[PDB]
Amino acid sequence: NADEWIDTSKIMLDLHIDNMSSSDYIPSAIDRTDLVMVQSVHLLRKTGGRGLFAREDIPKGTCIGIYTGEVYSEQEFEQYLKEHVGSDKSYAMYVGGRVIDAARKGNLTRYINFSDSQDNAEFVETTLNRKKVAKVITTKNIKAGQQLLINYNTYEEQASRYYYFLNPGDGWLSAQEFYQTYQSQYRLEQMPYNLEGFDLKAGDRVLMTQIGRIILANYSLAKEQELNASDIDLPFLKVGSDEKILDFDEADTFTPLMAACYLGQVENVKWLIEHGANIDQQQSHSGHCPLSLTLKGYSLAKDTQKYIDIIQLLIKNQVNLLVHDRSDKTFLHNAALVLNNLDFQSVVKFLIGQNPIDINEYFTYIDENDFDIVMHCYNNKLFDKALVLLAFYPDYFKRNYMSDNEGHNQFNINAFRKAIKDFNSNERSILLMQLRESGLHLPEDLLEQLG
Amino acid sequence: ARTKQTKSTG
Ligand SMILES: Nc1ncnc2c1ncn2[C@@H]1O[C@H](CSCC[C@H](N)C(=O)O)[C@@H](O)[C@H]1O
């Protein structure tokens, strides 16, 4: 057969694969074994998870490969699951009415992990042998050594229950090894004050970079002359009570931009941002991003607008405002709970001044209670913020409640009803009033179906 | 990833 000309053992060896056999590797024609390599992820050392990293730099829009695996139908796969205990849909791709399962046979694509914020690649439907298949396309220019991240385009509660918020910098080196490689840039100091937002107390030994010490001393990074640039996002290494460094799976580290956004150093925030700091860098366990820490500081610190400036700068630098917490609540969901009506309207006005491509992408997200951003405002009796959100997107009901797919329409109707369930007569009356005065031209049938 | 459309292609 022509298979006899494909030695998968050399492919597995060069790609650094150590958990597959020769007969279980299914290669394809567009597989670029020269551009990537399969390595380990120290954050996933307990579960034994691996990942796909870049051996060399890769431009944006480059073909990586095809998701290969065992072929099943939608009914045959359910039968296999029901007949084989222990089988799971973790490696299952539902494409073209077929299921490609890589739980036992696959290629290099099976090692790409999940990310719904820092995804640097995506799945695209293509054709092979006149059959529908899926391919991996890079969405951004990849730097050699970074980990590839992708969006599985599917939701499961177990994911948001204990999926580590992954960053491209998360590699195979441990904390001790990473410090050993960059011992020249790290000094061991003690915490001068307390930090509730980072679980640090006074006197706690912390290994930090010079940029970190400058940020902690409320100094200005611009006033310093010789500042190295490689340690831009080199994080703060915490030291345990046994005088040994806490690992990534043991504690959550943070970057200088995180502490800067939490403290309100607007000028240092701008310096870090313009010096290539990952504005979408997330904590592993908690998932806190610069925007969440900025909101926390806004809620805590008495002076308010100083964090509004940081939020405006982040939006101006096209930060991904679609991040969410483990409660499936986005940045807007939590921001409507911590910002006053005026500052909330100011942030909405910032996003309006940016004028995004599609506004409906901000409303398609739902929380654990199946409430979008408007339903969230109406569940907490935040009527004015819901009004300004409707002012942003006036076609909210026209597109989501009055479309062709009656299923989505009825789902949104029932979600809004479940949200306004715990209302009294006065709140329902003012809600229907504000709906009618809004000039959104709402037909009477929905006004009746809503309640 | 919990959108109104609660691996896959897209
Ligand atoms: N963001 C994330 N954080 C922690 N684990 C993740 C993750 N994304 C995916 N995983 C894990 O990876 C599996 C997806 S298939 C990816 C390959 C596998 N992680 C490996 O190392 O060989 C899932 O079963 C899930 O447990």
Author numbering:
A (entry chain A): 82 to 532
B (entry chain B): 1 to 6, 9 to 12
Quote the study that presented this structure, word for word.
One example is the secreted effector RomA, encoded by the gene lpp1683 in L. pneumophila strain Paris but present in all L. pneumophila genomes sequenced to date. This T4SS-secreted effector contains an N-terminal SET domain, responsible for the methylation of host histones and several ankyrin repeats, located in the C-terminal moiety of the protein, for which the function is not known yet. The homolog of RomA in L. pneumophila strain Philadelphia, named LegAS4 (22) and encoded by the gene lpg1718, shares 96% homology with RomA. LegAS4 is composed of two domains, the N-terminal catalytic methyltransferase domain with a SET fold as described for typical human SET domain-encoding proteins and a C-terminal domain with six ankyrin repeats, including the N- and C-capping structures.
This peptide is not fully visible in the electron density; only residues Ala1-Thr6 and Lys9-Gly12 could be modeled, with Lys9 in the active site. Overall, the P2 peptide follows the same path as peptide P1 forming a U shape, but the residues Ala7-Arg8 that are at the bottom of the U are disordered. Overall, the P2 peptide contacts the same regions of LegAS4 and interacts with both the ankyrin repeat domain with its N-terminus and the SET domain at its C-terminus. Arg2 forms a salt bridge to Asp451 (ankyrin domain) and its carbonyl H-bonds to NH of Ile447. Lys4 sidechain H-bonds to Asn493 (ankyrin), and its NH H-bonds with carbonyl of Thr445. The observation that both peptides utilize the same two patches on the LegAS4 surface, one in the ankyrin domain and the other on the SET domain, strongly suggests that both patches contribute to an extended binding site, with the ankyrin site adding significantly to substrate selectivity. The structure with peptide P2 indicates that Lys9 can also enter the active site. However, this conformation must have a significantly lower affinity than that with Lys14 in the active site; because, in the structure with peptide P1, we can only model conformation with Lys14 in the active site, we hypothesize that Lys9 could also be methylated but only at a basal level.
